[PDB]
Amino acid sequence: SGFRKMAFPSGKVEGCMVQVTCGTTTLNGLWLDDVVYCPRHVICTSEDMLNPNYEDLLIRKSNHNFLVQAGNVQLRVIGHSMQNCVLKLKVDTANPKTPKYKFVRIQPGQTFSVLACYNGSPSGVYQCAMRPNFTIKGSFLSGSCGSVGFNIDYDCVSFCYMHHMELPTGVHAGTDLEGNFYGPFVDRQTAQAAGTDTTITVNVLAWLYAAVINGDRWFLNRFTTTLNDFNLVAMKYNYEPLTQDHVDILGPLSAQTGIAVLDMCASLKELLQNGMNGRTILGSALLEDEFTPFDVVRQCSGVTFQ
């Protein structure tokens, strides 16, 4: 029983983390085989921050301008190249702690664990979701850049996020491990704002199923709804549109509970109208949207309380 915002065990990612210094700028690197991946803005100065020409900044760099440190051991850079918004540093040593890995670009609503690091050293691990507006609600301070988001499937670490910047609203923006930003953001200190955020409807429905699996049913009602009527109401509370794809993905959780997806949709529709009335669901007074259908099936029972 119980339900937690559970993170993946971080050990496979800790083993990859390095410190990268260019001039006075220090941030975190990801060391996989004989390549260190980091945010390209490690090569920026204070004057460069607004309108950096990265190609012009990089061309003035030698390999020995990059100081890469794995623990107290200095790695030796034998090559550098830029791919979109990531710097790729070729080093003379393959990381002996390299896990089975792959680079995946995730879609809004997808979750992952973040290993917040400073000076290539881990500070903590927490669970995040890619917001519909392509931000994450992270916990990042100075020196956290190059921190990475990941999932783990058996022994394989799928890297999906590298941290670049904080937006005015206190929310975070970053790239996949191929250096392409999520959302319309750019690695410049020019004025940028996150678009108005929405609630991840497919995830709230999953979390309500988790509540039923763990034996809570108070929020259920005797109603159903059409997919369209649900979306017309849901959009009025700043909820993501629920697609047929989302309904298909909730199929397994429907079967385990015996509650049709659109029956669960009628329950959510009621909760948005009524609030909580001093009650909680899985120890929350808000509808939680940072658990995916996969997260629920992973953490929850094959059986239900019932």
Added chain:
Amino acid sequence: SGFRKMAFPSGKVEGCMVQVTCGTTTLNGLWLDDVVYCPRHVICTSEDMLNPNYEDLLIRKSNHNFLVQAGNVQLRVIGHSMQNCVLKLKVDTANPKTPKYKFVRIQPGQTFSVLACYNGSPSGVYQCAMRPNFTIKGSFLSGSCGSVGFNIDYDCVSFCYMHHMELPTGVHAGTDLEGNFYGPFVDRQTAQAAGTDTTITVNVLAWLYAAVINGDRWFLNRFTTTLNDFNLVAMKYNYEPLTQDHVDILGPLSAQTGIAVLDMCASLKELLQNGMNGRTILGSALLEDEFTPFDVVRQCSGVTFQ
């Protein structure tokens, strides 16, 4: 900026988790030096757990009766003994991945990270608080027993919890690593209930300081109170007494924010009496009590461990 429920990096513990099998029962073990620590009820059959005599059950067991599996290698047991509610299995090999560590017994309201494991394999990591009623609000299915709770002190892991059982309210009970239960519980399949819990007042105030640091301020007030008037209100809402210790411990947060402890106690008093008036604090509609003063200072000032 940003504030997240953050676990310690789990890598140092991932390297210590093994699978322990006795007859048909399988659960998780902690492999440190040449000793494997696990719940003593691994020697029990499903029907022995009714009224187990662990003294009697163990004296009938031999070393080869304990199948201990680290990854793909079977370890050989050269001795077995009980300490309170934990079984200690002497093995042929000192764990080469053994971190610097100690066994620590924690107080209610103190937090730790739990590495959830199944068949000696880490599944997930989350942050917990020792409840005042000596339970944890964990997330545990069948086979999670022997999963451990820990804190990291620079490079030293302090082991504080071993998972033993789930109460009918869906909360969790276990021991320190010396096999002494937290709370009035016994490792028997007999009727047992969690005592009425209470809120950890020092943690809520600490969390309000984190909210202030991260720019959420609407709940502050011009009033002050005395400790004694606050505790009169606190106990009315089943909040823990706030001692002078607590006020001294929130010292480093009070000066750094410029908000006096008893002024923040005045803000808390108002939140309990009035509720939150449709508003949230760090994206929560409840008062969070699972962040310690130390936790807030540590996340908000960055950090590293080795």
